[PDB]
């Protein structure tokens, strides 16, 4: 699924991401925009053989199991394929774990480089939430 901006903002809110760990909703939508362009079936292979999965490009090095990332962990206890569903629950649930991990949203390199310190609230502007 390719979500709409405001559609995703709503879903994210419903799933409890708004101010989750201090991070306003706009931060999560901006991250999804630049990670996956709002597409739940986004995958991107990393140079180290790990792959990033779904709306928030969650990486198999640490967070999910795809059976092809040697020496990796599955800290979210999911198959990575769960991160590709039209239903964002598993993505959101794993992201709570990642953003709680200590570096906050800097875990998402695109959030750091493209969203951090920006008017992120623009991404939820005029959305019925
Ligand atoms: Cl699609
Ligand atoms: Cl693996
Ligand atoms: Cl933080
Ligand atoms: Na893994």
Q: Name the token pair of 70.
A: 């040697």
Helix axes 5-14, 25-36, angle to 10 degrees: 130
Tokens 């809110």 sit at which residue? 13
Nearest CA-CA partner of 56 in 23, 94, 20? 94
- Known binding residue 18? Answer is no
In the chain, after which residues is the C-to-N distance over 2.5 Å, breaking the chain?
Answer: none
Q: How far is the CA of 36 from the centre of ligand 4 (A)?
A: 19
Residues in CB range of 99: below 8 A, 6 or more apart:
20, 21, 23, 105, 107
- Phi then psi for residue 57, to 5 deg, are 55, 50
How was this entry determined? Answer: X-ray
**Architecture of the domain made up of 1-129:** Orthogonal Bundle (1.10)
Nearest CA-CA partner of 123 in 85, 97, 115, 92? 115
Give, rounded to a whole angstrom, the gap between the first and last alpha carbons of the chain: 19
One-character DSSP codes across 24-90: -HHHHHHHHHHHHTTBTT-EEE-TTS-EEETTTTEETTTS-B-S-STT---TT-SBGGGGGSSS-HH
Q: How far is the CA of 96 from the centre of ligand 2 (A)?
A: 22
Q: Are 76 and 63 in contact (CB under 8 A)?
A: yes
Ligand nearest to the CA of 80: 4
Ligand nearest to the CA of 36: 1
Catalytic positions, please?
A: 35, 52
Q: How far is the CA of 95 from the centre of ligand 1 (A)?
A: 22
């Amino acid at each position: 699924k390719v979500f709409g901006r405001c559609e995703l903002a709503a879903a994210m809110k419903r799933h409890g991401l708004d101010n989750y760990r201090g991070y306003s909703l706009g931060n999560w939508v901006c991250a999804a925009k630049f990670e996956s362009n709002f597409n739940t079936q986004a995958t991107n292979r990393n140079t180290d053989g790990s792959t990033d999965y779904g709306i928030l490009q969650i990486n198999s090095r640490w967070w999910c199991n795809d059976g092809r990332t040697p020496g990796s962990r599955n800290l979210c206890n999911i198959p990575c394929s769960a991160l590709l569903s039209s239903d964002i629950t598993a993505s959101v649930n794993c992201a709570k774990k990642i953003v709680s991990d200590g570096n906050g949203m800097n875990a998402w390199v695109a959030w750091r480089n493209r969203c951090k310190g920006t008017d992120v609230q623009a991404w939820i502007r005029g959305c019925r939430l």
